[PDB]
Amino acid sequence: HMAASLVGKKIVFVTGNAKKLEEVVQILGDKFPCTLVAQKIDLPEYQGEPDEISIQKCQEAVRQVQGPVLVEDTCLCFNALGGLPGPYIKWFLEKLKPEGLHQLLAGFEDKSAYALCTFALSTGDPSQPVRLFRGRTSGRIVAPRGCQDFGWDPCFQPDGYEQTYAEMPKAEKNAVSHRFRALLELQEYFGSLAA
Amino acid sequence: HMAASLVGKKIVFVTGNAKKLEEVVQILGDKFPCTLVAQKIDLPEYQGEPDEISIQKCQEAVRQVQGPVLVEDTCLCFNALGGLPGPYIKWFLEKLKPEGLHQLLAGFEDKSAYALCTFALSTGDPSQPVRLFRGRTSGRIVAPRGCQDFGWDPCFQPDGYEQTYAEMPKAEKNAVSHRFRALLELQEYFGSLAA
């Protein structure tokens, strides 16, 4: 009943920048039957499995907003490391840089990895559980190529491509993007019949 | 004024086991002027720098206990990785095992590391800030030696020794232990004149 109950309602998307809100609204498309409104809500970063961290974060956002809320998290997961750095990728990137992220795997033959995006939605009734929407993209960790301003994108090469996320033209990255995939699941949850 | 104000008072030590409480009480010694009482308080694990995670955790414990409280955290920090895995060591150990922890450094010449223990204390007046007490032990990450039931101890060799923490006799580990060092700072904070 969450979806139907949210048709025509404001959902707070937790972000601090309007362009990020714009991207999400465009990806969700004009039949998305809710109004997303950006708000910077201070949320702790939690340790845990990706799903637990997203739920935890969303529950904290519900405590603050006390109404419909949407949060986003993105992991980079190395298969040789059992999915790590995963939700700790921010810290590893900052310390190691794209070059060092690839160096972390020097001792492992398996360079495969996946990018993971999880969105977590609640109606803001704590009596109703958080729903998760995920997207994944399989690839491999490579010595960085492309412009380095783009987070860990220089060291991630999606399967089916000889270019890293940083190298790829935006339209090509979109076509395989873990974030687009996650947003497709959120879109599909509401369906396209209500707007 | 925190110390003096806590003389003769109950401090809740957040743990779920009586032996862990026993170890701390013995290390602090019989002139430690407060009564430590073990209680299992459910605390989230947070991401951040070691000090911020300890403060965050202690502040959450204060919200629950609303009185004097003491929490403990332990990191294993690889210098080649800018101090990582650090506060995320639990996850890395679980995924990689001691063998894989050492393998993580295959691509780096520098195998040096340090074990870090931080205790965080509050009086439980939120008007008073958390005080931290830390201890560190420098060493190197090695292919594991010794019994493997002992967390990451098999892959940590303290400086001045040709044995890992897992190999060392308990009395020897105590003499260099990061946890003992942290507890010495807590002991020194209260002093030995009040009991």
Q: What is the DSSP string of chain A?
A: -HHHHHTT-EEEEE-S-HHHHHHHHHHH-TT--SEEEEE------B-S-HHHHHHHHHHHHHHHH-S-EEEEEEEEEEGGGTT-EETTHHHHHHHHHHHHHHHTTTT-S--EEEEEEEEEEE-S-TTS--EEEEEEEEEEE-S--S-TTSTTGGGEEETT-SS-TTTS-HHHHHHH-HHHHHHHHHHHHH-SS--
**Residue the block writes with tokens 């931080």:** B118
d(CA B144, CA A8): 59
Q: Do A105 and B103 touch (CB under 8 A)?
A: no
**Residue entry with tokens 């965050």:** B56
Please report, for residues A174, B110, B150, the alpha-carbon distance to residue B154 in angstroms, rounded to integers and kept in the order given: 45, 18, 7
For residues B125 and B66, what is the distance between their CA atoms, to the nearest angstrom? 7
Question: Residue A5: phi, psi to the nearest 5?
Answer: -65, -20
The rounded distance, in Å, linking the Cα atoms of B163 and B152 is 14
Which residues of chain A are within 8 Å of residue B84 when distances are taken between CB atoms? Answer: 91-92, 95-96
Q: Could you say which of A46, A56, A103 has the minimum Cβ distance to residue B107?
A: A103
Q: Do B91 and A88 touch (CB under 8 A)?
A: yes
B57 is in an annotated binding site: yes
User: Which residues in chain A have Cβ-Cβ distances shorter than 8 Å to B81?
Assistant: 92, 95-96, 100, 104
| Cis ω for the linkage preceding B85 (within 30 of 0) | yes
Domain span at residue B85 reads 1-195
Asked if B151 and B135 touch (Cβ cutoff 8 Å), the reply is no
Phi, psi of B76 (to 5 degrees): -120, 120
CB pairs under 8 A between A and B: 67
Resolution in A: 1.6
Contact predicate B181/B136, CB 8 Å: yes
DSSP B138: E
CA separation, residue A116 to residues A68, A85, A102, A134, A172 (Å): 23, 12, 18, 7, 17
Distance CA A161, CA B184 (A): 56
Q: How many domains does chain A have?
A: 1
What CATH number is associated with residue B195? 3.90.950.10
Angle at A128 between CA A23 and CA A137, to 5 degrees: 40
Separation of alpha carbons A60 and A66, rounded Å: 10
Distance CA A157, CA A154 (A): 8
Q: Which two tokens stand for residue B166?
A: 């897992």
Distance from CA of B106 to the nearest CA of A (A): 5
Least Cα separation, residue B4 to chain A (angstroms): 33
Rg (CA), chain A: 17
In this complex, which of B91, B105, B106 lies closest to A84 when CB atoms are compared?
Answer: B91
Q: Cβ of B96 and A107 within 8 Å?
A: no
Contact across the interface for B104 and A104, Cβ inside 8 Å: yes
Amino acid (1-letter code) at residue B190: F
Whether residue B105 contacts residue A112, with contact meaning beta carbons closer than 8 Å, is answered with no
Is residue A174 annotated as involved in ligand binding?
no
Method: X-ray
